[PDB]
Amino acid sequence: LGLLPKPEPKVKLSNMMSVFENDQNITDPTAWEKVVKDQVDLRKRKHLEENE
RNA sequence: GUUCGCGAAAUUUUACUUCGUGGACAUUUGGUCAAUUUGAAACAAUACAGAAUCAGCAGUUCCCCUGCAUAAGGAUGAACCGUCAAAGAGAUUUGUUUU
């Protein structure tokens, strides 16, 4: 219906290589590393925040 | 009656022409492109078999690990002990080592 944003793909350090949807995958190697890692840390952050 | 093959004759061995001889000697069918053209009905145009592929996440089902919640259930540590507050009136007592 459009009331909720379309979900973006979950990216891990394993799956990191094979997701080409984002801009920076191959062309900027290290910033894409930072993107992925901060996505992971962000999910774990959501978990701990919910628990607290 | 049609052809192929062997033997004989007339001429220059194969060749034509004829005699004696061994076979072979049926026709059809199962063979239609579909789609489209206002007319006494024909196959004439008009096409003409051309009549999408790699990758990612998530979601259902079970399992393990780690959190937080909730229901129950347990184990252990924590040195010191419980039958009021204010004001007013009445009754009783009160020379030299530690100020």
Long-range contacts of A20-24 (CB under 8 A, 24+ apart): none
Q: How far is the CA of A14 from the C1' of B11 (A)?
A: 106
What CA–CA distances, in Å, run from A28 to A4, A32, A39?
A: 30, 6, 17
Q: Provide the experimental method for this PDB entry.
A: cryo-EM
User: By C-alpha distance, which of A24, A28, A21 is closest to A7?
Assistant: A21
CA distance A15 to A36: 10
A6 CB-to-strand B distance under 7 Å: no
Count Cα atoms within 13 angstroms, Cβ side, for A26: 4
Resolution (A): 3.4
A4 CB-to-strand B distance under 7 Å: no
HEC string for chain A? CCCCCCCCCCCCCCHHHHCCCCCCCCCCHHHHHHHHHHHHHHHHHHHHHHHC
Q: How far is the CA of A19 from the C1' of B7 (A)?
A: 97
A49 CB-to-strand B distance under 7 Å: no
CA distance A52 to A49: 5
CA distance A32 to A38: 10
Count Cα atoms within 13 angstroms, Cβ side, for A30: 0
